């Protein structure tokens, strides 16, 4: 029920704990686009999954990850990004504390 934000101020917004070393903040969205900050402790795992009807592009804001998309695997660090189009399996493993992915997708 919370309204989307014109301005997302990170240090004014609390974390939503997800368990197993992962927490997130839904940052803002429109009808067509959504941005979420996902924070991982070292060794936390974004279990591999796919989205049937939408694309995803994620920015590495901090730290580093091993990212596997449809069987290809790269170590990404802050500044890097990855693409997973609809129906592509993707997952991530944090390589260090305070590793952050900024997920964007079409909700």
């Amino acid at each position: 029920h919370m309204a989307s934000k014109m301005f997302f101020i990170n240090d004014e917004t609390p974390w939503e704990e997800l368990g197993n070393g992962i927490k997130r903040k839904v940052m803002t969205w429109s009808d067509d686009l959504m941005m979420v900050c996902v924070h991982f402790d070292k060794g936390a795992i974004g279990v591999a999954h796919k989205h049937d009807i939408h694309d995803q592009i994620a920015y590495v804001a901090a730290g580093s990850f091993e990212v596997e998309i449809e069987g290809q695997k790269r170590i990404l660090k802050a500044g890097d990004a990855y693409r997973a189009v609809k129906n592509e399996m993707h997952g991530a493993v944090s390589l260090e504390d305070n590793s952050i992915l900024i997920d964007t997708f079409n909700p």
Binding site: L18, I22, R24, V47, Q56, L101
Partner: peptide, 8 residues
């Protein structure tokens, strides 16, 4: 997302 979780 980069994790398995959905946001209801």
């Amino acid at each position: 997302g980069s994790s398995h979780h959905h946001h209801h």
